[PDB]
Amino acid sequence: MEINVSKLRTDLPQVGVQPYRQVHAHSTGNPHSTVQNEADYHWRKDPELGFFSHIVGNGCIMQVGPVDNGAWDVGGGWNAETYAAVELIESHSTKEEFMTDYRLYIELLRNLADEAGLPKTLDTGSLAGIKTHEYCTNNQPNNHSDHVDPYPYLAKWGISREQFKHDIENGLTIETGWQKNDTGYWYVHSDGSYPKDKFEKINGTWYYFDSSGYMLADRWRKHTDGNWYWFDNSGEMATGWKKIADKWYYFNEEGAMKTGWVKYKDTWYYLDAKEGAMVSNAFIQSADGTGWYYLKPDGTLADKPEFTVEPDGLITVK
Amino acid sequence: MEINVSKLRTDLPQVGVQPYRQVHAHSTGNPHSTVQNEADYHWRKDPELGFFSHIVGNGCIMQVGPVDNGAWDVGGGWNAETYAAVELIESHSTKEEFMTDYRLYIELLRNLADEAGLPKTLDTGSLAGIKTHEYCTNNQPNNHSDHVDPYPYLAKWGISREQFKHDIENGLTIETGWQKNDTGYWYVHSDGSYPKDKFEKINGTWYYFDSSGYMLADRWRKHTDGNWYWFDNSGEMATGWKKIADKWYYFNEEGAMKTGWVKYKDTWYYLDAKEGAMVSNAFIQSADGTGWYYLKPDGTLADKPEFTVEPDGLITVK
Ligand SMILES: C[N+](C)(C)CCO
Ligand SMILES: C[N+](C)(C)CCO
Ligand SMILES: C[N+](C)(C)CCO
Ligand SMILES: C[N+](C)(C)CCO
Ligand SMILES: C[N+](C)(C)CCO
Ligand SMILES: C[N+](C)(C)CCO
Ligand SMILES: C[N+](C)(C)CCO
Ligand SMILES: C[N+](C)(C)CCO
Numbered sequence: 171m172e173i174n175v176s177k178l179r180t181d182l183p184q185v186g187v188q189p190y191r192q193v194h195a196h197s198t199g200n201p202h203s204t205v206q207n208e209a210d211y212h213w214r215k216d217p218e219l220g221f222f223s224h225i226v227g228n229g230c231i232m233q234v235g236p237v238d239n240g241a242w243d244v245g246g247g248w249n250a251e252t253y254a255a256v257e258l259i260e261s262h263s264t265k266e267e268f269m270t271d272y273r274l275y276i277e278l279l280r281n282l283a284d285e286a287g288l289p290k291t292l293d294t295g296s297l298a299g300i301k302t303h304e305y306c307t308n309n310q311p312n313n314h315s316d317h318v319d320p321y322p323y324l325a326k327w328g329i330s331r332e333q334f335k336h337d338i339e340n341g342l343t344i345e346t347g348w349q350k351n352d353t354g355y356w357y358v359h360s361d362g363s364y365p366k367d368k369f370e371k372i373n374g375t376w377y378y379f380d381s382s383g384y385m386l387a388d389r390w391r392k393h394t395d396g397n398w399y400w401f402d403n404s405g406e407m408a409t410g411w412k413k414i415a416d417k418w419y420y421f422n423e424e425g426a427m428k429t430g431w432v433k434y435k436d437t438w439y440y441l442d443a444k445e446g447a448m449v450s451n452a453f454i455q456s457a458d459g460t461g462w463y464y465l466k467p468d469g470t471l472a473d474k475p476e477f478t479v480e481p482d483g484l485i486t487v488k
Numbered sequence: 489m490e491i492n493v494s495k496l497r498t499d500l501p502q503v504g505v506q507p508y509r510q511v512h513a514h515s516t517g518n519p520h521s522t523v524q525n526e527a528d529y530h531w532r533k534d535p536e537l538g539f540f541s542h543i544v545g546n547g548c549i550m551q552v553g554p555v556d557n558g559a560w561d562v563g564g565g566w567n568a569e570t571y572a573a574v575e576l577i578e579s580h581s582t583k584e585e586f587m588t589d590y591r592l593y594i595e596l597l598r599n600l601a602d603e604a605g606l607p608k609t610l611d612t613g614s615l616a617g618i619k620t621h622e623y624c625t626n627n628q629p630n631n632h633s634d635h636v637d638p639y640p641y642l643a644k645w646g647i648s649r650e651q652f653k654h655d656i657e658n659g660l661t662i663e664t665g666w667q668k669n670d671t672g673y674w675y676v677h678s679d680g681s682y683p684k685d686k687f688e689k690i691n692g693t694w695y696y697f698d699s700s701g702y703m704l705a706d707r708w709r710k711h712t713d714g715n716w717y718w719f720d721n722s723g724e725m726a727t728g729w730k731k732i733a734d735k736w737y738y739f740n741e742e743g744a745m746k747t748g749w750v751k752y753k754d755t756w757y758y759l760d761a762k763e764g765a766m767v768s769n770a771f772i773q774s775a776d777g778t779g780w781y782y783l784k785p786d787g788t789l790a791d792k793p794e795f796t797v798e799p800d801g802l803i804t805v806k
């Protein structure tokens with residue numbers, strides 16, 4: 171992993187003695203500090219106020235103290251078991267920024283446990299392994315701590331204590347971008363979320379995803395704007411003219427199915443106001459209700475319709 | 489009451505002695521005999537086989553034996569309490585024929601109880617009053633009878649034992665023909681039934697009655713034949729042209745709302761196939777799909793429509 175050691179303090183005291191049986195998972199408790207803020211403060215601060223080894227934030231890891239040397243990180247006896255103490259910043263604005271750092275945090279904690287010759291377990295009853303500050307607060311001997319990080323901050327962004335344990339113990343893989351199974355496609359954002367019952371523009375193209383997250387393909391959808399949209403076999407939102415089930419429809423540049431008069435090259439077409447399909451061999455009343463326009467069998471507006479009237483008088487138009 | 493005494497036997501023996509405390513309600517137990525059949529048989533028969541005083545059937549009452557003389561009618565000790573014994577025939581083909589006779593039966597039983605100085609009660613615990621053969625069978629001393637008339641035959645035509653008792657004790661009024669309350673009209677047939685959810689022709693005129701029996705007035709109804717019918721303020725089924733809520737409809741001679749082309753005097757009108765109303769200022773495609781007929785703003789078919797075409801070319805028709 172890439173580790174920034176520019177603020178790694180080399181003047182910190184050893185706490186306890188080897189072997190160190192624990193890696194400690196923390197969060198800063200600061201809603202505004204960046205990873206650099208934390209490193210700079212840690213750099214100049216009085217170590218007796220507490221110290222640690224790594225800070226994860228803003229897409230990077232800054233090692234601020236030694237490993238395998240104990241630490242004053244959990245306010246109690248298990249300071250003497252600290253192989254490493256990893257802090258996660260709490261200043262994320264979005265779940266995406268959080269997940270980016272959470273991935274590094276999980277990988278770092280797991281790596282440090284392996285390096286220290288410890289089980290990759292979270293908050294178990296054995297002395298060794300990865301322990302949260304909460305677990306230390308609750309279980310360490312000679313405890314002087316009331317901290318319960320990082321569970322509250324993780325829960326904020328949707329990581330339950332059961333998920334944290336699972337990620338620590340299994341590692342974390344988030345398959346992002348287009349995904350597919352036997353049922354259909356879905357699209358996973360950087361943070362693991364995916365669109366459901368909504369439009370999403372992906373790589374310059376609009377798609378719609380159903381309530382389970384499945385991309386709509388070869389399907390109509392009446393949107394919330396009261397408009398009809400159509401999605402072809404690739405899921406792409408229809409624009410322009412489309413022949414759908416042997417009928418012609420027209421969609422504007424924003425995908426909305428149009429009704430009424432639409433110009434096409436040298437001619438005009440009329441799309442049924444009720445069902446949307448191109449109308450043919452029909453009279454359409456003018457907007458001022460003065461008169462009528464005739465649409466030929468091929469759908470094109472009759473520029474110069476000619477009429478013959480039988481005695482009936484049945485009208486034939488041409 | 490009108491009583492036919494042409495077959496009144498004067499040779500029957502007295503049974504018991506005055507006073508006679510009971511009027512007995514019977515039914516013949518014969519599914520085919522008419523009132524005359526019963527009277528003729530009673531006339532020639534061996535009295536020891538049983539006898540009575542009145543037979544009600546076919547819209548009349550034939551007195552076949554004396555009153556106030558006892559009778560051999562109930563096969564037991566209360567033969568000696570018989571002031572009168574009234575038999576109802578069981579050969580009715582319809583509920584109407586039954587009700588006609590049932591009315592006479594009720595009135596006769598009540599009248600005979602009054603005449604005999606007895607309470608107009610049915611099957612009570614006191615010695616006196618109107619007693620069914622069933623009640624006698626069940627309660628008389630020295631019983632040799634298993635007859636339970638007239639309850640089964642009454643129940644056949646919809647008179648429960650509770651109704652029989654009520655009619656005997658209160659008398660019976662059936663208000664027939666047109667009836668009305670604050671909600672609407674209903675029409676009561678001779679037998680007390682009235683039409684519900686159906687057409688009924690009354691005095692040469694068709695009406696429709698809802699599921700509670702209320703006549704429909706100023707209302708549409710889609711019938712079971714898939715046709716629409718309309719009923720005006722008097723309930724009469726619409727035929728011919730009707731303007732309903734400012735729109736014109738046409739109904740054929742059987743009341744069915746017509747759609748399509750209808751001839752009227754010197755002209756043709758067209759009634760919308762979907763909602764039925766007269767169409768105006770519109771083109772209607774010919775049946776062979778060859779051409780069109782134009783309907784003027786007033787709804788009349790344009791015999792000689794004349795067209796002018798603007799460059800648009802917007803068509804104006806006249
Ligand atoms: C993530 N999937 C789209 C596979 C299913 C959601 O319900
Ligand atoms: C001919 N239409 C106008 C209907 C479709 C064009 O592609
Ligand atoms: C309705 N959307 C704007 C989401 C798509 C079309 O532009
Ligand atoms: C009627 N539309 C064509 C608009 C939607 C398909 O069902
Ligand atoms: C009645 N039609 C309209 C069908 C024919 C005109 O004469
Ligand atoms: C006899 N009524 C019509 C009054 C009511 C039936 O439900
Ligand atoms: C004029 N209509 C034909 C519509 C009605 C006749 O009474
Ligand atoms: C449908 N009915 C026959 C009952 C009435 C019209 O004639």
Ligand SMILES: C[N+](C)(C)CCO
Pocket residue numbers: 708716745763764
């Ligand atoms: C539509 N109709 C006129 C036929 C029935 C009224 O609701």
Ligand SMILES: C[N+](C)(C)CCO
Pocket residue numbers: 431438463471800801
């Ligand atoms: C497009 N309209 C049919 C409205 C006008 C013809 O030029």
Ligand SMILES: [Zn+2]
Pocket residue numbers: 195196197243303317319
């Ligand atoms: Zn902590």
Ligand SMILES: [Zn+2]
Pocket residue numbers: 513514515561621635637
């Ligand atoms: Zn009897």
